[PDB]
Amino acid sequence: GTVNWSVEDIVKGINSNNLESQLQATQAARKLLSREKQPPIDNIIRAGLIPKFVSFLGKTDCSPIQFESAWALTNIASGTSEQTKAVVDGGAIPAFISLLASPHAHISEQAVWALGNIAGDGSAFRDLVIKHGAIDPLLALLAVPDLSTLACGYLRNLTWTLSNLCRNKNPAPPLDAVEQILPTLVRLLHHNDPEVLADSCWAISYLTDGPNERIEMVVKKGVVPQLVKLLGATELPIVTPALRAIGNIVTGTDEQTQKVIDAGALAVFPSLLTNPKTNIQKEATWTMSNITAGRQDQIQQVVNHGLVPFLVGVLSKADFKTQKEAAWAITNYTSGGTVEQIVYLVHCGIIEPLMNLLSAKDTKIIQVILDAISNIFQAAEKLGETEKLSIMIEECGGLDKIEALQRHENESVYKASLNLIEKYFS
């Protein structure tokens, strides 16, 4: 009936002065815009059908044409930025916000879906959706005693749309919009559905990626223990944003970083640092590097949890990106560590894997490793054990690598390598 219609037939049906003919043509447009292979989105836009679909959103007297036009517009809004702009330019934002209060849950869900796609385009459309007042009617749809009474797909769509309102930077979402959404977000973080948990974690990861004031807003809500619990989940779609959120929080103050340690996050790192997914290993090592950039008592907790052999591990064998992050963790550790903590790092066998990475064709990693060498030598200077460390670097072929770096293209590498040879190897 409404299967494989031409754009011309859809236009002829929608332009008729018959609500039923318009409904059949709108359903046909929705089915066309729903096909897997190349939906004719640009053809539907060029035919001028977006203003017709937006006007059909207001037809309270005909709920099926509201549903079909909402679905057709959602398919267009899910496309490119230009295709989302076309939906917005047609005045769809206030029309979709009015449908959030619809007594038909399938129409209300379609409006949630459409607003998520519009907000998801970027900062300007996100903030425009907020200015048209979408947050209050969206939050009211979740104002129930128990989230488990809501339809699974409906809750998943609401969570996803809320995460897009938390998403993007330059600028970050308005502070008052973040404050309004956060209590509902804390609630969705304690829900049992894995998809709701994944998208709630992604929302929290977006809110914790920025200045320490943004991290504080989130950390103040007491979500850190729940994020650590989700960090230990079996589902990779939950662990990925949960680790991203924990990683973002430890970029903050020593006090914010401490909340992560107090919640027992370090006990999950033996498995995260050996995770078969390289991106988990990479982001877990990035997280470790920011914790080793903390207080000496925070470095001590890394030591106590037996995580230094795990850092020797990732430095010895991992994808290059994870090895570069391990280098950072070592340099941060040697920068803020006590002599005893730096001595411990050497006893765990950090020197040989640290030297082997001086062969990398990466200027930044080489500078990072050279700074760590200097730091370790400074600790050996305080104990008169510089000779023991010099022999250690000589034996694993580290001296050959530093001597060769005395002819490196980069100025900082050239100077740092010449300094070490002259101070401890001459």
């Binding site: 729903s34 899910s78 796609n117 385009d121 996803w160």
Partner: peptide, 6 residues
């Protein structure tokens, strides 16, 4: 992220 409904 944006999302289509099939």
């Amino acid at each position: 992220r944006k999302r289509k409904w099939s």
